Design an enzyme around this catalytic site. Structure first.
Site, mmCIF file in Angstrom:
data_model
loop_
_atom_site.group_PDB
_atom_site.id
_atom_site.type_symbol
_atom_site.label_atom_id
_atom_site.label_comp_id
_atom_site.label_asym_id
_atom_site.label_seq_id
_atom_site.Cartn_x
_atom_site.Cartn_y
_atom_site.Cartn_z
ATOM 1 N N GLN A 2 12.055 -27.097 8.531
ATOM 2 C CA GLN A 2 12.707 -26.828 7.253
ATOM 3 C C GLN A 2 14.084 -26.198 7.436
ATOM 4 O O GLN A 2 14.234 -25.195 8.137
ATOM 5 C CB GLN A 2 11.835 -25.903 6.398
ATOM 6 C CG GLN A 2 12.509 -25.417 5.122
ATOM 7 C CD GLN A 2 11.527 -24.810 4.147
ATOM 8 O OE1 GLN A 2 10.839 -25.520 3.421
ATOM 9 N NE2 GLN A 2 11.450 -23.487 4.129
ATOM 10 N N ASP A 32 19.355 -34.262 -16.240
ATOM 11 C CA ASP A 32 20.161 -35.059 -15.330
ATOM 12 C C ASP A 32 19.764 -36.534 -15.297
ATOM 13 O O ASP A 32 19.234 -37.063 -16.267
ATOM 14 C CB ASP A 32 20.031 -34.458 -13.935
ATOM 15 C CG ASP A 32 21.333 -34.400 -13.216
ATOM 16 O OD1 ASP A 32 21.831 -35.476 -12.850
ATOM 17 O OD2 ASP A 32 21.852 -33.288 -13.018
ATOM 18 N N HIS A 63 21.788 -37.939 -7.947
ATOM 19 C CA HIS A 63 22.392 -36.723 -8.475
ATOM 20 C C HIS A 63 21.368 -35.686 -8.946
ATOM 21 O O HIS A 63 21.372 -34.548 -8.483
ATOM 22 C CB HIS A 63 23.335 -37.107 -9.623
ATOM 23 C CG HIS A 63 24.185 -35.979 -10.120
ATOM 24 N ND1 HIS A 63 23.892 -35.284 -11.271
ATOM 25 C CD2 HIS A 63 25.317 -35.426 -9.624
ATOM 26 C CE1 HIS A 63 24.805 -34.349 -11.465
ATOM 27 N NE2 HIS A 63 25.679 -34.417 -10.479
ATOM 28 N N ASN A 154 34.840 -30.481 -12.460
ATOM 29 C CA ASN A 154 35.566 -30.661 -11.201
ATOM 30 C C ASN A 154 36.964 -31.239 -11.389
ATOM 31 O O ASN A 154 37.328 -32.206 -10.719
ATOM 32 C CB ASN A 154 34.790 -31.595 -10.260
ATOM 33 C CG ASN A 154 33.321 -31.224 -10.131
ATOM 34 O OD1 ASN A 154 32.976 -30.062 -9.914
ATOM 35 N ND2 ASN A 154 32.447 -32.219 -10.262
ATOM 36 N N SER A 220 28.551 -29.342 -9.819
ATOM 37 C CA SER A 220 27.231 -29.798 -10.217
ATOM 38 C C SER A 220 26.179 -29.244 -9.260
ATOM 39 O O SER A 220 24.994 -29.188 -9.582
ATOM 40 C CB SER A 220 27.188 -31.320 -10.196
ATOM 41 O OG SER A 220 27.472 -31.851 -11.470
#
Ligand SMILES: [Ca+2]
Length: 274
Positions: A2, A32, A63, A154, A220
């Site tokens: 991990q 989303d 995304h 952005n 995001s």
């Protein structure tokens, strides 16, 4: 094994997790492009789709899965690590495979979230124009005690132009700017008077469609960091109200410079959790 994205230690999500609080019992809805529910490192317990012909538990874009991974990537021996790995994840598709959605679809997501008892709502999306319908739903969720987090946008800066999009621009919505591993504002992090707090947005590694992991750049990705810190704080003092959790977030943030560029500063979950 991990992997632990640099983002979690940077915001001190590990010191809290270490204390034992991982956001368990907290319901976090991610508005989303959906989530690859069958992802090994994710655990989506439900949600809904307001995109015609698409189920909420599939991500044809990547995304929403990435953003979700930042919030609650499972704490195990594989993949990455989320900010609040025990949070009750909910996927609300309000965007399609191309990353686009309509105002009705998005507000519908904001309404289902509040109506269904979500504690936190993440919106790693943004637009130039808002809407009286969007403002209402958002103020509503907040009014109901729902912490609302959204990407600041952005579009970098240009002279003195406020470039913070919607819904980030709404008072009931927390606007998130992006910083890199060195804690320096990212070149794409929009600026404006509404900018509230900063979080890792550059080079963030998270879960990506078809049991994989990818690195992406954007405000995001900074958002889920704050959406997860909220759950973390909520899993410590479950009595706190939205405005309170929100205030501890920005009132204990690390000062990085002018609010026009860094808002109140980089968030610190260990300090914000009392
Ligand atoms: Ca994992």
């Amino acid at each position: 094994a991990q992997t632990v994205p640099y983002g979690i230690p940077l915001i001190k999500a590990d010191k809290v997790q270490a204390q034992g609080f991982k956001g368990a019992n907290v319901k976090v809805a991610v508005l989303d492009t959906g989530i690859q529910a069958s992802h090994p490192d994710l655990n989506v317990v439900g949600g809904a789709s307001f995109v015609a012909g698409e189920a909420y538990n599939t991500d044809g874009n990547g995304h929403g899965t990435h953003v979700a991974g930042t919030v609650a990537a499972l704490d195990n021996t594989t993949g990455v690590l989320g900010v609040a790995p025990s949070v009750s994840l909910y996927a609300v598709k309000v965007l399609n495979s191309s990353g686009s959605g309509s105002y009705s679809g998005i507000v519908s997501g904001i309404e289902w979230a509040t109506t269904n008892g979500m504690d936190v709502i993440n919106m790693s999306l943004g637009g130039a124009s808002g809407s009286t319908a969007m403002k209402q739903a958002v103020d509503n969720a907040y009014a109901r005690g729902v912490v609302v987090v959204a990407a600041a946008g952005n579009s970098g800066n240009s002279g003195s132009t406020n470039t913070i999009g919607y819904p980030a621009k709404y008072d009931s919505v927390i606007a998130v700017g992006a910083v890199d591993s060195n804690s320096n504002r990212a070149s794409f992090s929009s600026v404006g008077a509404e900018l509230e707090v900063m979080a890792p947005g550059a080079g963030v590694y998270s879960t990506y469609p078809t049991n994989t992991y990818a690195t992406l750049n954007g405000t995001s990705m900074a958002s889920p960091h704050v959406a997860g810190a909220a759950a973390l704080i909520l899993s410590k003092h479950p009595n706190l109200s939205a405005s309170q959790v929100r205030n501890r977030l920005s009132s204990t943030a690390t000062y990085l410079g002018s609010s026009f560029y860094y808002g109140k500063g980089l968030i610190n979950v260990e300090a914000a959790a009392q």
